[PDB]
Each structure stands twice: as structure tokens, then as C-alpha cells.
Amino acid sequence: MSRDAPIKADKDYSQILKEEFPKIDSLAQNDCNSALDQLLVLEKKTRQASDLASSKEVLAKIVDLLASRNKWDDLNEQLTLLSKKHGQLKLSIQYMIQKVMEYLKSSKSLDLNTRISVIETIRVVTENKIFVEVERARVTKDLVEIK
Amino acid sequence: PGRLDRKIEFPSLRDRRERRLIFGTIASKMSLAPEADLDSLIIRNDSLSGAVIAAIMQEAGLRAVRKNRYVILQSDLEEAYATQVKTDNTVDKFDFYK
């Protein structure tokens, strides 16, 4: 955001960890926690831009697990925790959410998924004020049809 | 006197009972929260003139259009109450005149 140092440096690191993208994947197949530990580091940066690149990796990791209801709770939770603290500006983390929210929709192929997914989505958006709120209502709305 | 032996001074201090009577007259014109307790508002108002209360119904029914109703509720009344009665700041000044 500020200074001219974060734009370049942070981006530079995300490139370096994107060359180390196969490494994160291989470990994720052996145990979830090992690769998860990498996502934590990525989503602590100071430039908004370098987190765009990195919020692909957060979505991809849980896709490689395929997907686990227990693991689902944590990913959406970690995001909520990062939003209150900073998120690299509170406006920044809302576009991150928007990317991961498309995945929630298309994951859907159980009742089981649908139920867990509405519990995470309602909470996120109570402190947000954008298009996130339309999407929350819509996924909530799948459970309405079932109701 | 003899010019003007009758002299009526009009207060704004009023009475609790006086405020109930302004509300009723208004209520005939447009019912304000007719499914909820009116009487809270009466207690809460404590300086208001008849004018502020006329401004209340009219501003509430502005908010009626927004909310897209043809009826005024107590929520409309409470925001009508909140503002139009908090003008000036002298809070700071009176810290050192306490």
C-alpha cells in the first residue's frame, strides 16, 4: 500500500513461492497440515496485489484434499480471523472471499456440503458491505429449496 | 391592561398529559404505530414543543416511502425522536465551566 518497497518485494516472494507451487501440493497429499502451514505465511503480506496471487493457492489446496467437512470449517474460519485483524486493508480481503465463494458453489454435490457451507457464509459477510452479501443469500437459498 | 388585559403566555415545558393530547390529533390524521405502545414516546419527550412532534410524524412518513409502506411504525418514530433534538456542541466547552 504505502512506500514503494512492498509492491516489488512482496510480489517477488509470491513468484518465488509460485515456482515452489509443486512442493506445497506434494506435501498436501501426505498430510493436510503440512501444506496448510504454507498458506498462513502467504496471506500475511502488506501489498494487496501479492494476496490476489496467493488466494488461488488457498482455494487450490482444499481442492487437492477433496475436501473434507472438518477441513472446511477451518479454511473459512481462517479468512474471518484474517479479515478482523487487517486483511491488508479491510477492502482487500473482500475480494479474496469473492474468489473462494465461487468454489463453495461448485463443490456442491451433497446435502452435507450445502448445510456446512451455509454456516460459514452467513458469518463472513455480517461485517462486509459488497456483492458477498448477494452471494451469501443465494447459497443460503439453495438450503431454502430443500426446506 | 385595557389594551391587552388578556395575555396568554405559551409554554413548551408542557406536561406529560399535554403531550398525549398532541399525539392523538396527529393520530387522527395518520395513525403512528397503532399496533405498538405509543406511550413510551410520551415519557421520552421532555422538552419537545408541539412543533417538533408535528415534524416527527411528517419525517416518519417520509421514511414510510423509503421502507415502502403506507404505514408508520414505532421504529420510524424512534429515529424521528433521535434527531432534530441534538443540535450544537457545547459538551467540550462545559468541561471547563463544570
Binding site: - | D92, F96, Y97
Partner: protein
């Protein structure tokens, strides 16, 4: 006529000369946030230096008036120095004639009384500085007393000063509403610094650096300040919270 040009009463009963003093302490645009810990009192304040050719180390607003009692100043630095000099002199004097160092309460009251006298005199201008006095006394615990240019002071659970201080009030109010006590329940003074920095970022929206901060901590029976190196440890420790 002269009911606004000297300290005489007006038909309003309000001294306009005195009002003008409070309308000059927020024009330096320095915010402060002061919180009472469970064993300490921490005060952090702005130290915005926009120049290459001003030495930032000597730009300061935290002056040690006793070895145990710090003082943080919001408002013009000539008046700050005069009020600091006077306060130091009195604190020393109290040791000399009463056999123990001046309490925070009474040091606040003494500057408060001098401020009234300066607005009693019609040729003397009051010192236009808001003084926050932080300490840990042994008879009052962690304490904050904040005096103002008129000569009014009171104790505080926490307090803020500056133009944007209303935002700071919101954070503090929530904190003590939830805890249901008049202080922070944190038993490490370092973490009360970390908390203070967090609420400063929340209130003002501004991301701080070690050269925008200046930190004073009164622990029990000593007052110290953090250097910019030590303040950087705290800023790294926000990332570890």
C-alpha cells in the same frame, strides 16, 4: 470590548480567551492513547516527522517529570517545555518538604491551580497544552490524571487526546464494557503496549512505524521509554498475535 481579548467575564459568563486555548492543542495534530494495565500504564503518541533535516530522535513529546511519573503533551512545544519545567520543579520540591516524591494526583492538581491563576491574570496568557500524566503510584495503583489548559483535571480509566480522539474512545469503551473493569487484565507490560498499538491502528486507520510511534511505560516504581528498536520488536509482535 475586551471580554474576548483578556480573561474577564462576558455577559454569557464564558471566558472566550480560555476557549481559544483548547483551539490550539488540536492544531499540532498529535493523537495520544493511554491505557491502564494491571501493573503498568502505557501511553503511546504520534511523532510525525516529515523532514529529512529534522533529527527524529530529538522530536519528542514524552518528558519525564519524575523518575516514576511520565508526562505526554498534546499541543504546542514552547508551552510544553514551560509546563514541564514548572512540574519538575514542584515534584522535586515535594520530596524536599514532605519527604516523599509528589503523587500523580497532586502534581496534576498543582498544574491545574497554576492554569487557573494564569487565566485569573489578564496580562498572563495560559499555557495552551493538554498534559496527560501517567504513573504507577503505590497508593493509587496504575493511574492517569489529565489536566487541561483551563485548570480542570480528573482521573481516568483510559483517555485519549488529539483531533481524532473520538475514534480512540470507541475502542476503549468496548474493551472496558466487555471486561467489566476499569483496566486491562494483562500482567505483562509489553503486551499492554501491543494492545495499545492495535487500537491505535483500529481507531485512526493508520498503519504505524517505529518512527511514527513514541512509547512511554510506567511500571511499578520506574518510568522508562522504549527506543525505536524496542518499538520495532512490538510491531513485529503484532504479527505474532
Amino acid at each position: 470590548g475586551y471580554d474576548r481579548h483578556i480573561t474577564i467575564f462576558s455577559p454569557e459568563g464564558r471566558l472566550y480567551q480560555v476557549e481559544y486555548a483548547f483551539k490550539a492543542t488540536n492544531q499540532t495534530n498529535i493523537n495520544s492513547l493511554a491505557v491502564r494495565g494491571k501493573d503498568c500504564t502505557v501511553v503511546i503518541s504520534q511523532k510525525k516527522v516529515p523532514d529529512k533535516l529534522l533529527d527524529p530522535t530529538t522530536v519528542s513529546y514524552i518528558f519525564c517529570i519524575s523518575r516514576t511519573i511520565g508526562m505526554v503533551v498534546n499541543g504546542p512545544i514552547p508551552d510544553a517545555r514551560n509546563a514541564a519545567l514548572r512540574a519538575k520543579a514542584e515534584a522535586a520540591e515535594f520530596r524536599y518538604k514532605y519527604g516523599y516524591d509528589m503523587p500523580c494526583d497532586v502534581l496534576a492538581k498543582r498544574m491545574a491551580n497554576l492554569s487557573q491563576i494564569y487565566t485569573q491574570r489578564a496580562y498572563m496568557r495560559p499555557l495552551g497544552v493538554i498534559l496527560t500524566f501517567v504513573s504507577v503510584d503505590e497508593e493509587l495503583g496504575p493511574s492517569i490524571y489529565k489536566t487541561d489548559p483551563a485548570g480542570y483535571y480528573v482521573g481516568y480509566k483510559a483517555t485519549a487526546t488529539g483531533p481524532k480522539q473520538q475514534e480512540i474512545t470507541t475502542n476503549l469503551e468496548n474493551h472496558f464494557k466487555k471486561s467489566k473493569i476499569d483496566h486491562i487484565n494483562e500482567e505483562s507490560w509489553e503486551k499492554v503496549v501491543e494492545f495499545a498499538i492495535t487500537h491505535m491502528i483500529d481507531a485512526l486507520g493508520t498503519e504505524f512505524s517505529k518512527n511514527d510511534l513514541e512509547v512511554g511505560v510506567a511500571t511499578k516504581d520506574k518510568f522508562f521509554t522504549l527506543s525505536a528498536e524496542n518499538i520495532e520488536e512490538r510491531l513485529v509482535a503484532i504479527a505474532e498475535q
